[PDB]
Write a protein that binds this ligand. Structure first.
Ligand SMILES: CC(C)(C)c1cccc(C(=O)NCC2(NC(=O)c3cccc4nocc34)CCCCC2)c1
Ligand SMILES: CC(C)(C)c1cccc(C(=O)NCC2(NC(=O)c3cccc4nocc34)CCCCC2)c1
Lengths: 244, 244
């Protein structure tokens, strides 16, 4: 083993649909991370923490109306069991549309935790007091309406799993340059000559320039948090001028 | 049947990991939408469109380096087969970090399509010319680094499935008011009295006010695209003043 024994990542998940998480534990990069014991994903289902015959996991809001909520007691008890399994130092995250907007800086922050517990909402969400009593942070993957927090949780797991030592073992955070692979001519469209030139120093400059221009045109906000290198500033200035 | 015969939604998916999509086709709201034939999700795997013995689906970039790309020919041919199955009028969406940022306005737009084809990238993505020759629109669920476009595609499916007639059959786009359910007192924390008052007109005003304040404090950008009602402007002004 090349990876130190205490660098694996543990993520507890609280969800009414634990089987959804097979999508990240059995496929692709995260799938290989679980199989090689770099990532452990453990799920607790609030349905298993009910005591009534029909395993009721939703409840009605005070004040009335059709917007059902997650029942407090089964959710809270699932969370308490995850905390017990985690031991000390687990950070409890509620995936929620009222949370801090997730971005790569945020992922980096979250990935500094060896132990995470992710709480996925269903119905109209969870009791506000549970946020105060059980939740450490609220995070959102975007401003759109979903039917559950499970896809956001899986998105977050995918994003932080890239930071686990053994997986793959900020300029990269800019948008990619255009990518080209075989064939040389695709329905009449040709690869930029420099890319097929074998001049790897020219290729390097070209790719960096294209990445900068594309970030500039499609996500300029990403540049606002960076003090670019001299080369990057030079290439970006060139691309900006040539774009007129 | 209460729902017209031609209002079902069809979504073709192009992905190296079709089994991931079980997470949306077999669970929750989308799961029920598929079972009741309101939503149809059909997947094509580029691996099935290869002709070499080891079913190779990645290729090397012109110009070199470790960043592998999706092999053009199997991906393109999977897309062509999805287009054939779709028939006329299917919109082809590439889930991509260089795409338009998804928000609820964007979801609403996408949901006006009866037929969508979603292309999920792996490795470092797809050949730029394929975007020109096969892709209609690029969309991104957020600014963070993922290992595949499958979770974004599923997120998008979850978001647009809410617009299908028979599922559930812009003020709602503001952040929710705080939600409260049983018990009346949770670890000493009490429900706001108005909510347990039975005064449903007071409750309505309180919930709207709280929703506005919370949108104001946590997602003010959402208010920039709306001309609020007189009641909403009155309640928001009150919450803003009382927040000092
Ligand atoms: C103004 C805005 C953002 C459009 C909005 C406004 C009001 C409600 C929602 C919404 O989607 N309620 C449903 C709910 N969503 C999420 O869990 C969720 C959604 C999006 C990004 C996320 N990241 O993590 C979790 C996320 C799932 C069921 C349990 C309650 C939360 C959205
Ligand atoms: C500047 C920024 C955004 C941080 C960034 C910069 C450079 C690369 C990436 C990135 O994630 N490349 C990997 C890749 N991502 C996605 O598919 C993807 C990610 C996020 C939101 C999405 N919505 O749809 C699809 C999305 C999966 C493998 C195939 C190539 C794309 C990200």
């Amino acid at each position: 083993g090349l990876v130190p024994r205490g660098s694996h990542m543990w993520i507890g998940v609280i969800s009414l649909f634990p089987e959804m998480f097979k999508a990240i534990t059995e496929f692709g990069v995260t799938g290989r991370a679980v199989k090689h014991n770099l990532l452990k994903v453990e799920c607790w289902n609030p349905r298993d923490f009910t005591f009534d015959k029909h395993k009721t996991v939703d409840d009605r809001p005070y004040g009335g109306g059709p917007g059902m909520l997650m029942m407090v007691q089964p959710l809270r008890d699932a969370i308490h069991t995850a905390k017990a399994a985690a031991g000390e130092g687990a950070k409890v995250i509620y995936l929620s549309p009222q949370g801090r907007k997730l971005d790569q800086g945020g992922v980096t922050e979250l990935a500094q935790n060896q132990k995470l517990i992710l709480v996925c909402g269903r119905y109209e969400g969870i009791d506000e007091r549970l946020i105060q009593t059980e939740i450490d942070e609220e995070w959102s993957i975007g401003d759109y309406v979903l039917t559950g927090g499970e896809l956001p949780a899986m998105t977050l797991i995918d994003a932080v799993a890239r930071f686990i030592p053994g997986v793959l073992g900020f300029a990269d955070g800019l948008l990619d340059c255009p990518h080209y692979t075989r064939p040389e001519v695709l329905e009449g469209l040709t690869v930029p000559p420099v890319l097929m030139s074998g001049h790897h120093e020219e290729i390097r400059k070209w790719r960096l320039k294209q990445s900068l221009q594309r970030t500039w045109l499609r996500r300029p906000e990403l540049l606002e948090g960076l003090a670019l290198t001299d080369e990057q500033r030079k290439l970006l200035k060139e691309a900006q001028a040539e774009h007129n």
